[PDB]
Design a protein around this ligand. Structure first.
Ligand SMILES: [Zn+2]
Ligand SMILES: [Zn+2]
Lengths: 502, 502
């Protein structure tokens, strides 16, 4: 339910997430928790997509009435989600209440010391923290995947006769318990939970519902750490209780378990692809010579490669659509490493000689600039990898320290509008600077469109800066770093010919 | 209250943490929460010290009686602490209940994709997560410190006249509120908490106690992110309440705030050292023409470098003492990057010719080894940087795939014991292999001591393997990786002359 806004005046990706309730008191008092979680999920997905797609704006309609950002705030859950996604929120996020809408300006994710290339809401990779199954964070998932990639995946020793207790004792006891044909009710186990043992108690009515939900994460955790045994039908005090069911119910539960396990995504770094080796068994529980219920014992063998509970929760924007990254793409991102100067001189001279009014217009525009660089091109759209527009005479990019980059479009057609072309070119330039260029600061690109009359009259048809508003951080840019990022982006785009004079 | 155990037979650092209650039920039912937290802190400090000092063993006396590791477990809080310290607990930790003691075998911390060189319980660096002050994790602290080190530390722009609301509005409103000479009781604020605003309500009796405790972390968070304003004396609904106090109480509170702020550690990456720029003000609250109480407003300016709430909580073992890393050392670690083969041939030939029984003893010992490498030295203690023992004839290190490394000490003195020398040499060798060598797997070093009689009689005085027990993971080692780590350690120790023949 996230759509790219094509009617916006901003020269960047604007994602509309629909009506969102804002304010700490307003969000904490929302009666419908499902709606609040859905709004949080939509905002988080939009933020992740913008982080992975070169930055942009999240536009949310303010659902609650009489909302003031200064007086109310944002909301604890949204802030917690932002903190989970981003280590330093002020470095990436800006908030602005514009009329009835809330704008979250999101900077592109930049490679840092952590080594992460993309942002993930949840890697859906689980591990065993001695007794608990926890979803690997970005750093843990990165380390796990790189270690498995490097190694293409992943008897007894004589010891002194000393009476010791280890996790191997619990694993052996659980294995012996697994092979028991029948069980006795109200008997205590000789083992407890460990890296290879998990014990859960579920009601009969909720068992089928929870098998589709919690079993995948425990199976992923076991297959990722060392394998293990999951026992369902034992209470907190390790007493055998079980759940009452019929043979048909047992068959249906076994089928559901098989479907849930086979649905789990699996990525292999080895040459020999393998399935998840699991064994499901049902042990009858006998009380006073009568069958009380059944205990479900699931043995999950150690897996050679990554096992996912669900597809990794990473998003991006492609073809003006918010798409979740496929497992292969996510794995590839995780494991695979990465005065005024008028240039070029020849093109500037040709443009100034062919069109006399263009030079006067450039001088008038640049009289207000303290120091900067102006780069001319026949079509800046082509240099960014987009389609050429033959009606545009030329494009000019201005990089100055006191102002954000400005793209100057010039056209000879009086009755045609070039707002969309210039906006798309500026959006692509910003994305290339952020991702390919390597610029690590907040950057926005403004546009100015001019009509060059044959008699030399110049008029400013469109001025982007006077129609859109940004946080102040976007209005101050580092000229040297901008030039370096532009040089790197042009070099990587195979469109660097004479933009920088050496 | 953590001491290095010098009476242990293990050839590694054994840290005794005293009596520790173990078991999930036992620990969750502990009446004294202070004692439980103290035990958890001691175990965590010992684990961090062992991780930073080349690995070792944590020995804890089992306080509770009738404790079985297989039946009871470890404890939720201890497991959570271990998970916080280590991304993958099974990769580093092994647990063993030996008699009345509990042994935690800890592998040395190895450099990984995260870039961390040491482990920290808490960096004590705080940041602002929009409304909350949170302690930077290891990755966040690493990124923050490296960014500040790289840059040697760390007007208005014209915008369209659009009615918008940002965090700057809240900051300006808080600044205006800061300069007010007097306040009126039961009036609502025009701003709320943000990246630059924190609002807390404290009782009069607990105000002095909490100033020494919670003020440093908020001051650190403000000085680390963007500065801000802290307001004490306002309830949840942003109504001005204040706290009743006298002028002497105000002076004492101001002195306590000054002492607390000046006590905070500060590290500077810039040339010009600066103090924490803060301003403390007390605003009277007037109700019906009478003074009700006072509101404390603290303005913390943005700081140029790192501000610590406390010294970073990182530990190591030096001179057989568990010492907390100093701030300078912690900063330096964070920000600054890093058949049977008989060698050497000449020394082996000389030893075999001088002592005939030595060759026979070596052959008898190596007849049981499938494949490995034996390296002889005049004194392996010298090659590891320790003091030479002239009574020891020679030392031999055996590296095999089926067995852990074994150090063979040979002596001609019948009435003297060399257990301590061999144990210290093995401990130093293990530490050098783990840290300097770069070995990333669990490794233990056994020792065997032999007496070479002048007539050629050989006797095994001490055999370490038969007297100590390790988890099975320590009994299987990678021979090629062990040789590579040994080569790297010898090269970095300037003691590599002819150990490996090329
Ligand atoms: Zn595989
Ligand atoms: Zn400084």
């Amino acid at each position: 339910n996230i759509s790219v806004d094509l009617e916006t005046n901003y020269a960047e990706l604007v994602l509309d997430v629909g009506r969102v309730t804002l304010g700490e008191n307003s969000r904490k008092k929302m009666k419908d928790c499902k709606l609040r979680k859905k709004q949080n999920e939509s905002v988080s997905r939009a933020m992740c997509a913008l982080l992975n797609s070169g930055g942009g704006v999240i536009k949310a309609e303010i659902e609650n009435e009489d909302y003031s950002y200064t007086k109310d705030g944002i909301g604890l859950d949204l802030e917690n989600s932002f903190s989970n996604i981003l280590l330093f929120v002020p470095e990436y996020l800006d908030f602005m209440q514009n009329g009835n809408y809330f704008l979250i300006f999101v900077k592109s994710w930049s490679l840092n010391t952590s080594g992460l290339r993309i942002t993930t809401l949840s890697s859906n990779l689980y591990k065993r923290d001695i007794t608990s199954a926890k979803v690997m964070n970005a750093t843990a998932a990165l380390e796990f995947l790189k270690d498995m990639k490097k190694t293409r995946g992943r008897l007894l020793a004589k010891r002194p006769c000393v009476d010791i207790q280890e996790e191997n004792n619990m694993k052996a006891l659980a294995g012996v318990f697994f092979d028991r044909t029948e069980l006795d009710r109200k008997e205590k186990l000789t083992f407890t939970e460990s890296t290879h043992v998990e014990i859960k108690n579920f009601s009969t009515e909720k068992l089928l519902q929870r098998i589709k939900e919690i079993l995948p994460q425990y199976v992923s955790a076991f297959a990722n750490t060392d394998g293990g045994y999951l026992f369902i039908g034992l209470n907190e005090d390790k007493e055998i209780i079980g759940f009452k069911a019929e043979m048909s119910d047992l068959d249906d539960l076994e089928r559901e378990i098989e479907k849930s396990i086979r649905k789990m995504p699996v990525h292999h770094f080895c040459m020999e692809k393998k399935k998840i080796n699991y064994s499901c068994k049902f042990l009858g529980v006998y009380d006073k010579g009568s069958l009380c219920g059944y205990v479900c014992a699931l043995r999950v063998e150690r897996f050679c490669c990554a096992v996912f509970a669900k597809e990794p929760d990473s998003w991006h924007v492609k073809d003006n659509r918010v798409m979740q990254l496929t497992r292969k793409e996510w794995i590839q991102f995780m494991v695979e490493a990465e005065r005024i100067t008028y240039t070029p001189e020849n093109l500037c001279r040709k443009l100034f000689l062919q069109h006399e009014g263009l030079k006067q217009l450039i001088c008038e525009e640049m009289d207000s600039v303290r120091k900067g660089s102006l780069i001319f091109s026949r079509s800046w759209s082509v240099d960014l990898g987009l389609q050429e527009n033959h009606k545009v005479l030329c494009d000019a990019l201005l990089i100055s320290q006191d102002s954000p980059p400005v793209l100057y479009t010039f056209h000879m057609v009086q009755d045609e509008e070039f707002k969309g072309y210039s906006t798309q070119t500026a959006l692509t330039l910003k994305q290339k600077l952020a991702k390919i260029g390597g610029y690590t600061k907040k950057v926005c690109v403004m546009t100015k469109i001019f009509y060059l009359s044959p008699e030399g009259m110049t008029s400013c048809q469109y001025d982007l800066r006077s129609q859109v508003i940004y946080p102040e951080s976007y209005y101050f840019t580092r000229r040297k770093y901008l030039l370096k990022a532009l040089f790197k982006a042009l070099k990587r785009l195979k469109s660097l010919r004479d933009q920088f004079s050496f």
